[PDB]
Amino acid sequence: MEMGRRIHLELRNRTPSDVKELVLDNSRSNEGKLEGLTDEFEELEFLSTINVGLTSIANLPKLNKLKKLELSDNRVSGGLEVLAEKCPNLTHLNLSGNKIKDLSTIEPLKKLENLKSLDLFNCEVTNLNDYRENVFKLLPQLTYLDGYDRDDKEA
Amino acid sequence: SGKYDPDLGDFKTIEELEKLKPGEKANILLYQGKPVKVVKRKR
Amino acid sequence: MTLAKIELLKQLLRDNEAKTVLKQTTVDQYNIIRKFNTSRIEKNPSLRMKWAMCSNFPLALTKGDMANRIPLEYKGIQLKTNAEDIGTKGQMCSIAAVTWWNTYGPIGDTEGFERVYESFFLRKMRLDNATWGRITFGPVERVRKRVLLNPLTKEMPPDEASNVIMEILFPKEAGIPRESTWIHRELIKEKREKLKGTMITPIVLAYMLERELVARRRFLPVAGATSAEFIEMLHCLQGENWRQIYHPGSRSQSMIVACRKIIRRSIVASNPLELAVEIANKTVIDTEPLKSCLAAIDGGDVACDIIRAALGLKIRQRQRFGRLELKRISGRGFKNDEEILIGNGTIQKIGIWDGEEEFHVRCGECRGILKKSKMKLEKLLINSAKKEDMRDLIILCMVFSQDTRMFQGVRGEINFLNRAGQLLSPMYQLQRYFLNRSNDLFDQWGYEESPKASELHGINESMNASDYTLKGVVVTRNVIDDFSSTETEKVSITKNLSLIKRTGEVIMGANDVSELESQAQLMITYDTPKMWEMGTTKELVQNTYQWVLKNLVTLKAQFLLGKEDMFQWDAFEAFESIIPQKMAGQYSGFARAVLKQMRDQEVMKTDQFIKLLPFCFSPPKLRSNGEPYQFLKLVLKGGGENFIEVRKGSPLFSYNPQTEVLTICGRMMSLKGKIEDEERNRSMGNAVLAGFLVSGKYDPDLGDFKTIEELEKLKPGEKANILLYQGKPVKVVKRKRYSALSNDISQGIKRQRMTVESMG
Amino acid sequence: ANMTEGKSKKPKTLAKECLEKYSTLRDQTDPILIMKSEKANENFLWKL
């Protein structure tokens, strides 16, 4: 199975601007990328990339309608500033299970202002003193986190 | 709004009360043996 | 070879004797024909083998092309000869060629041994990883017991074992699969897949499977554990004057609980037998009906024995009274009604046994011999096994003996019932009274001097090995071995579940079962609404989801039609009991709207369909305007963890599509995927020639016969010409459904009794 | 967690109530082994 097969199954061989969500899960990728998603995409709301072996974020269509994106179980470790230049309209961010070394990796999210929830589970950065407080004062725009900002609501 | 109804479930902690939504009914406990049933209000 | 087969057949028929015998003896009679061998068995195998090993070519090689791999003489050593043979019609050879083959020659495949000889390698694994301990040189007390020599993958009776073996490794000759392949479908498919890819002779595999399935049991002297794993090593573990510590490298409790629940459910109603058997054969334990572990173990709890009697199975004919297992030794007791005053002052009319009798008595780990006369216990010999078991044995034998002292020792009252609320006979009422208050007849029974002797030593009322024992009771420091001649004699079953001998005598009563509740260590999934309206909400949800899952094909087919008849199913009525009354209607309306949307504007999604279907049993209550209410969290009775998540999953229900698995009430089940493709993968076991019924005779209109692979090509409802068993041409029709004879019989009985009651 | 008024109760009753609240974990009978010690036996520990 490949990203192309998932794209064909979800789109069912139709125009790219017909679905506002994608499910790219359990898909092998060339050197850890997210190919199979052409830049021609114009409308997209939800994303899902799990067990894709994504190692970096360097290929992504420019978008202005996406609000949620899901990355998990990946060895990606690099600056995410490119998201601002690609789609500065993210509201739900999920990095659960990813591999991030230190706090500097999550710095480039400051320039994004629409993010309200960020998820980081069993991450090497999560095991630090005052990581919760340090992240909060580092990303003032954030309104939610792993789930315990002040209360518990569901996405 | 009512009285103890085991069917609705056990007593709800403040954590669930704070995250509740209007128009939903819950159960609380004043002290041992005097439970009560309450409902959230917009006002 | 088939041409060689036909040529050999023609040559054999050329003689008139072959023609007359072949055309005379039917296929069934073939067995007799085979047994007419010379039987000139060697008188002394040792001498024969010794002589043969010194002969030039004792080995009898089968004619073939293998010999060309090896010369008739290698390195100046004679190996094989080209002289003809009369005994086997092959060639002759010597162990020299065998050793050379072990040295050089063709190299075979090593895969087959990984799985084919699974039992042997499992034995080796259990030996290697075992942990040894100290050795206790002191004397060891051993009891003779009927033990299973070797562990079994799935114990089954010999006939079922043979049928399963044939269904596994003999795809042909599989006419009309019985009511045994569906029970063992998982074993069938597992062994079929494992043994595929081999080239060993089929008879070897058949014998190995027989060893792996058919049970082997024997009388052995054992002390301590008794599972087959320990019996394998009994030769090293045990010892007359030495013992070793050994730890080799469940369903029972669940079946006990299920049988007890079935007994309690059926007793309260009239005609308990039919209802009990319906529930028993409609029950399942995680992969199989209850006739997969009941038929495995020998005997068991009284409830299991009664259920087996209700079903078709063999039960040990020991007399169960409360917990006592009694085996008569001699004497005949005349059961005559008599009026006896009880110690409480009341007078009861009950049956008493005139005449002397003796019984081997067992209870848990306690064994003994009891000798009783009418209205009196005479003698009791026991071994020290356990305080609880010894007390139970003493009290139960006391009550059974109907000793006048036991009656005069009553002090309270006898008006008890069972969990079903029924008044029992005075004997069982007294049993319960004395067991509840053990220190009632013990105090006033009277004491007897200690058994002054080399080994015979007494026991006091407190069960401690203390002298000044009870009148009659004696504890011998020896081993009492009892319960011989387990004939499994013919036993009848009355409607009220109480068994009786070939004569009118009663062996097991409906009330022998003890009213003790436990927790099923496994998913006890039934198939009848009547049963599961007892337990907790979680059990109800699990059973409803299992009912939905089992008959997924029918529900999925009815979904396409789009009619409300699909939703008005009795299976969900019990579910209605665990949904809040004030809000169930809104759930039903919301789920109905969601499922209508699913049918209209999207495609199949099994997980959400299963999740949302059951809540629609109750009538809907739409919004004032008319639109359905919307929810995302269905609350259930008990609150807290008893709640369903509409979106992805919850504690009671969570389906993961990455691996396509289903977790219900903390139990993982494999939904390979969706689609009739996954339906057929579920049907990947079953049995060869299971989708075809028999109808008509040869009917040569179809010409020659067709294989199973070509049989599948025919569309449902066609007619095909096939061979059944060893020949027997017949005409078959491909089935359009899956059948269950037990369900049909149960429904017929239900209709019959409904008619009887309505006329009455 | 199991919210309580504040009364003192025997540890056995507290454990029983806590397992009742999380009934799913209590009724787990099929263990999905994830890691094993060099010498310890998983079956014995699970049965215990």
TrEMBL record, chain B:
Q: Where in the cell is it found?
A: Host mitochondrion; Virion; Host nucleus
Chain's gene name:
PB2
Please report the organism this UniProt entry assigns to the protein: Influenza B virus (B/Memphis/13/2003)
Q: Which family does it belong to?
A: Belongs to the influenza viruses PB2 family.
What is the protein's name according to its record?
Polymerase basic protein 2
The UniProt entry annotates the motif Nuclear localization signal at 40-43
Described by its record, this protein's role is as follows: Plays an essential role in transcription initiation and cap-stealing mechanism, in which cellular capped pre-mRNAs are used to generate primers for viral transcription. Recognizes and binds a wide range of cap structures of target pre-RNAs which are subsequently cleaved after 10-13 nucleotides by the viral protein PA. Plays a role in the initiation of the viral genome replication and modulates the activity of the ribonucleoprotein (RNP) complex.
Q: How does it assemble?
A: Influenza RNA polymerase is composed of three subunits: PB1, PB2 and PA. Interacts (via N-terminus) with PB1 (via C-terminus). Interacts with nucleoprotein NP (via N-terminus).
- Please indicate which superkingdom the organism of origin belongs to: Viruses
Please give the first and last residues shown and the length of the full protein.
Answer: 701 to 743 of 770
From TrEMBL, chain D:
Q: Which domain of life is it from?
A: Viruses
Q: How is it modified after translation?
A: Phosphorylated on serines and threonines by host kinases, including human casein kinase II.
Q: Which locations, inside or outside the cell, does it occupy?
A: Host cytoplasm; Host nucleus
Described by its record, this protein's role is as follows: Plays an essential role in viral RNA transcription and replication by forming the heterotrimeric polymerase complex together with PB1 and PB2 subunits. The complex transcribes viral mRNAs by using a unique mechanism called cap-snatching. It consists in the hijacking and cleavage of host capped pre-mRNAs. These short capped RNAs are then used as primers for viral mRNAs. The PB2 subunit is responsible for the binding of the 5' cap of cellular pre-mRNAs which are subsequently cleaved after 10-13 nucleotides by the PA subunit that carries the endonuclease activity.
- Which protein family is named in the record? Belongs to the influenza viruses PA family.
Q: How does it assemble?
A: Influenza RNA polymerase is composed of three subunits: PB1, PB2 and PA. Interacts (via C-terminus) with PB1 (via N-terminus).
Q: What is this protein called?
A: Polymerase acidic protein
The gene name reads PA
